[PDB]
Design a protein around this ligand. Structure first.
Ligand code: NI
Lengths: 438, 445
């Protein structure tokens, strides 16, 4: 780790010792360096993958400081190998240029669904800038330029910023505070040149989709989500799989729901089952039947669901929106099952006590939550009733919890959680407002 | 009026011919006189500027206004024109002085706040004001650089003799036909202040305009008291006055006028308050139960009766109540008011009388007396037994109406059939997908 680097340190010292001169097979030390360099570049790729998945709501508690430290350490080994000292010279100098180019990274990625005529930010950071730049020579200027997928295989304003040192900051960065721009993918190339003969630095951003406000971004959001999720580390720019495993998809979705909604309760296997039924148009109640399936892009955002007028992602993002705006605390409190069929509800609820209810998302509309519940009398015969789905607007007028209370028929949330636990003069006759079922 | 001006313009010609003798230099050249005639015209204009200011102040409470300064400007322009000829005519030192006085007072009277600053002001909130110089086209321009005008905030004491973004040029617009200073975003970072606008040009002269009075509140709302202070001052000032004196007591007739205009401007409506309303209002303020409008006609109001004395049996003042119906109506009820579906101002007691001879399901809408910003339904219910009961349903607030509108609530109630007198509710107010429909509904007890 740092242990291997420890080796590299020990060797320089020896060749230093072996320098009197009062054989040079030690410069397999250059190889030992080269190996260490490839190694870092690998870590740098790993961090980018991590950052790409964070675009989708993955946990990214990764600082770039560790990668910097290591990079600086390798340069220190290089300088020593250089000062000590044929052909190896080309070699080390090759180590250096490689490292330097790999050290220029986008650190704050820009909005990946980006609207025109809207203010945006990105930032690029150079890991080795605290070895090669600084005060004597003027800071190199980093440009921002939008590019097509075609160009990246090789309109923005406020696109130039100096790449600057912070000794307090312990970094070299250029941050664009004030950027504005005036299915189809593109990127921002960030560009700077510097001599330490002059080298040109390029960072390519994560892919973007540019939209003009309204209408807007459901499609664009699906695209970013697919690319972020299913991308290959070493891909040719903006190429993704068309089909992916459903298990990978389910994951991607759980992370998404958590991020958007704002909750740490995710989706279960039981949720994935009802999801899978919908995406695949299947009714098996076995998680086994859906565990090793493949998903395509079409199934996800292109083929409209059976008996519906929307896609699967349109539906899913519809529930995200709804949950995020109205339902977030209810979802955290585990008051909503949410993803369950009307059909399976009937099975769960038929044997239950009168007044037992559950909360699901509407299968048939976008952004809907409905009440399903069991009604049974003294004859003992159960009937299930499904109350029409509520929307975001309906939920503004009166909240879900209020509506649940308004109803005397409703007694316990499944399974047996009392509705009251679970949910939070002068001569005038009282009037009240209650939700009412016909 | 203008007649005078023609007559002046004629006499000034008369002197020109006369001066051809052909020296008078020191019918008979008692012919100024023409100069007194000028001074008088000047007094008339000063009076007109004054009248205009009163109008603008009244508009502050929702009075009609719609007046332009352009006529006043032409009137000033003409007067300068006479002064100038008269001056030219003098080529007797009284006269040059007297005439030099005429010009002085007119120019100084000429500087005005055309667009007033907001009368209730918040700190760190941004606002607009405008000043205009009526004689600027004559006296500023091409040789000079435009005078800079200052915006300062002054006290009442200071005004008898903190804002930033506050210096603006006083420039002529030839297409604009005016000389004006516009302050687009001034920022400010029982108590009355004003904005003093200050310029100096040489012709030096110092130009001063003082705004209408302002109350600054530091958030830390309310702004109820501030608004009352501002309303009374605008209403009940004298043209005469010193900053910023107001009367303590005024006529209720005058108050009623004030309220009516306010209710319209503020609410967004052209339907005002009737005498039937004013009666009920009089009862509240004066705490008197007379049902004759005559009882209240020569009555007078004080500032105290208006915003300082807590209404009897209540926790609130009269203005506090009035301003409360205002907010409730502006927010929720404006169309309903316009459509005339609200009686509004009527007592619970008077309601029993109107309704008790009416048919079943007949109703009205009133503002609640016991609350701030409330609207209630009163209605008559009569069975086959034929005995009437009046039911007053508890009042609704603004919050309540946002949830379900008042029209929706009225509709919700099968008992309510016709709005008084005899307007059908319906005119006035106007499984699947195997889910069972749900609605919000309002229920009575
Ligand atoms: Ni109208």
């Amino acid at each position: 780790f740092k242990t291997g680097l420890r080796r590299l340190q020990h060797r320089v010292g020896e060749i230093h010792l072996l320098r009197e001169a009062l054989a040079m097979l030690l410069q397999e030390t250059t190889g030992e360096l080269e190996a260490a360099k490839a190694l870092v570049l690998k870590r740098i790729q790993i961090w980018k993958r991590q950052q790409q998945l964070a675009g989708n709501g993955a946990p990214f508690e990764e600082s770039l400081a560790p990668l910097q430290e290591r990079c600086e350490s390798l340069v220190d080994i290089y300088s020593q190998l250089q000062q000590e000292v044929a052909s190896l010279t080309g070699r080390l100098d090759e180590v250096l240029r490689t490292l330097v180019t790999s050290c220029f990274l986008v650190e704050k990625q820009p909005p990946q669904v980006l609207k025109t005529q809207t203010k945006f930010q990105a930032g690029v950071r150079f890991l080795l800038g605290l070895r090669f730049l600084g005060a004597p020579a003027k800071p190199p200027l980093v440009r921002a330029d939008m590019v097509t997928e075609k160009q990246a295989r090789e309109e923005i304003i406020n696109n130039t910023v100096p790449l600057e040192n912070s000794i307090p900051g312990n970094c070299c960065s250029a941050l664009f505070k004030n950027l504005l721009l005036k299915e189809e993918k593109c990127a921002v190339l960030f560009s700077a040149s510097f001599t330490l003969l002059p080298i040109q630095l390029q960072a390519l951003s994560l892919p973007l989709v540019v939209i003009v406000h309204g209408n807007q971004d459901n499609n664009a959001k699906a695209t970013i989500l697919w690319d972020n999720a299913f991308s290959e580390m070493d891909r040719v720019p903006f190429v993704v799989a068309e089909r992916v495993p459903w298990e990978k998809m389910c994951e991607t979705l759980n992370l998404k729901f958590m991020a958007e909604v704002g909750t740490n309760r995710g989706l279960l296997p039981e949720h994935f089952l009802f999801l899978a039924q919908k995406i695949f148009n299947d009714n098996s109640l076995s998680m086994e039947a859906f565990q090793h399936r493949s998903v395509s892009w079409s199934q996800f955002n292109k083929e409209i669901l059976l008996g519906r007028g929307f896609t699967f992602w349109q539906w899913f993002d519809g529930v995200l929106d709804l949950t995020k705006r109205c339902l977030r605390s209810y979802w955290s409190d585990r008051l909503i099952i949410g993803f369950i069929s009307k059909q399976y509800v009937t099975s769960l609820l038929l044997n239950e006590p009168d007044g037992t209810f559950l909360l699901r998302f509407s299968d048939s509309e976008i952004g809907g939550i409905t009440i399903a519940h069991v009604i049974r009398g003294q004859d003992g015969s159960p009937q299930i009733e499904n109350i029409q789905p509520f929307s975001a607007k309906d939920l503004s007028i009166r909240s879900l919890g209020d509506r649940i209370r308004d109803l005397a028929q409703l007694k316990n949330l499944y399974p047996k959680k009392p509705k009251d636990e679970a949910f939070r003069g002068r001569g005038y006759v009282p009037a009240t407002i209650k939700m009412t079922v016909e």
